[PDB]
């Protein structure tokens, strides 16, 4: 059973360099091909390159040649990705992936395809500064506009970097909840909104509090949203 | 530089149905080295098929792969709830490995017009010289939906962004959030803020608006 564990999220300034590690446990490390695959937010997968530890034979995709370096520490069953001259477009979740083996076990004939993946590492390349979001209410009353249903929410604005988390009434309220993926504004800051639909009749009696947490800036906020 | 084209981008089915996904390579794939991956939102891809038709142990037998040369197919005899996700093909028949752009397999359900809500900017945000206007399209299907912002009957452009949730696991609907951001200065020059929504479940475009200061 092969498990790959990667290093944590990173925030890099344009032009800098980043190194991501991938620690393997299980099966044989030096005789199987280990590749790195990335994925920009909302985009598809993109193979970047890989290495065969034992032979140290690397293979990099042409568009990353001379900016990328992959190595392997057989003593620690750890593989590394080093990407230099970082650009904002490099922002992505990076994954290491080892090829699988035929049949059961993890020592059979290799198969080339990627059977084992790491949890992924989010790498944000930007010149923005770490910052807690401002949280504004999305107050409910437009004659409700749609049946006996009311919508209310919270606008979590201008934070950096990702992620942020939102819950309502400390997690007591979950039905009808919609937290939207964040959008990257031209300012270089993220913004997203969290809404919940509720019976319009509860607008006068139920308290609605959104709990917003941005770990990167150690920011916790509780905003009461009122009619 | 082999290019893999997966078509269509989206397939609309339901649990119990059969799904067929294609991948076409701009040139023949060496030794039929094509793999298929399933990926769920925020999760790492999972290998389904390799060598075009081989299925590793651990992968449900409902997953099957066929083809050779430049045309490959992924079949799922009968769909289960967790099978609705994005599927990616990959060729490793050359040192330069490449992935297809992915095909989304969503759940097809009855058309459901969205409930539309519009929110003016909060006083608090305004105090800082910025006004965000938010339009919400709740629980709709299909996913195709157009939202246009009109300020005093002037179509807006370049000053808004939108986000869409993943298909709901229970009602199979989508929700969309659109935010229109103006400076408080420009915001105060206009009276009527409107959100015009166009959707297949709506006989005619729906509009939600408010007058600054009400």
């Amino acid at each position: 059973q092969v498990q790959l564990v990667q290093s944590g999220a990173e925030v890099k300034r344009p032009g800098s360099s980043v190194t991501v590690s991938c620690k393997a446990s299980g099966g044989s490390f030096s005789t199987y091909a280990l590749s790195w695959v990335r994925q920009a937010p909302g985009r598809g997968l993109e193979w970047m390159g890989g290495v065969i530890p034992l032979l140290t034979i690397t293979n990099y995709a042409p568009r990353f040649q001379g900016r990328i370096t992959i190595t392997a520490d057989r003593s620690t069953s750890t593989a590394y990705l080093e990407l230099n001259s970082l650009r904002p477009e490099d922002t992505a979740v990076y994954y290491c992936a080892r090829e699988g083996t035929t049949g059961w076990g993890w020592l059979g004939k290799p198969i080339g395809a990627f059977a084992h993946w790491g949890q992924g590492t989010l790498v944000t390349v930007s010149s923005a500064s770490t910052k807690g979001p401002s949280v504004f209410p999305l107050a409910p009353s437009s004659k409700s506009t749609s049946g006996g249903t009311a919508a209310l929410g919270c606008l979590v604005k201008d934070y950096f970097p990702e992620p942020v988390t939102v819950s309502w009434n400390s997690g007591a309220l979950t039905s009808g909840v919609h937290t939207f993926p964040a959008v990257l504004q031209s300012s270089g800051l993220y913004s997203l909104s969290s809404v919940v639909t509720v019976p319009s009749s509860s607008l006068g009696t139920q308290t609605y509090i959104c709990n917003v947490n941005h770990k990167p800036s150690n920011t916790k906020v509780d905003k009461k949203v009122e009619p | 530089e082999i290019v893999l084209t997966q078509s269509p981008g989206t397939q609309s089915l339901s649990p119990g149905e059969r799904a067929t996904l294609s991948c076409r390579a701009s040139q023949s794939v060496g030794n039929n080295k094509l793999a298929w991956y399933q990926q769920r939102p925020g999760q790492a891809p999972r290998l389904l098929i390799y060598g075009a038709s081989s299925r590793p142990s651990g992968v449900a037998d409902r997953f099957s792969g066929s083809g050779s040369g430049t045309d490959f197919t992924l079949t799922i005899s009968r769909l289960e709830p967790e099978d609705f996700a994005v599927y990616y093909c990959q060729q490793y028949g050359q040192s330069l490995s490449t992935f297809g752009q992915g095909t989304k397999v969503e759940v097809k359900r009855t058309v459901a017009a969205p409930s539309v809500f519009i929110f003016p900017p909060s006083d608090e945000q305004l105090k800082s010289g910025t006004a965000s206007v938010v339009c919400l399209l709740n629980n709709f299907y299909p996913r195709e939906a157009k939202v246009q912002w009109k300020v005093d009957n002037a179509l807006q452009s370049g000053n808004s962004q939108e986000s869409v949730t993943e298909q709901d696991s229970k009602d199979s609907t989508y929700s969309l959030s659109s935010t229109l951001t103006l400076s408080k200065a420009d915001y105060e020059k206009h009276k009527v803020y409107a959100c015009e929504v166009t959707h297949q479940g709506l006989s005619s475009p729906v509009t939600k608006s408010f007058n600054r200061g009400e």
Binding site: T31, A33, E99, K109, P110 | N31
Partner: peptide, 12 residues
């Protein structure tokens, strides 16, 4: 093909 090397290696 780079992707074939580990096989030749495995057969050794």
């Amino acid at each position: 093909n780079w992707f074939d090397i580990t096989n030749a290696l495995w057969r050794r």
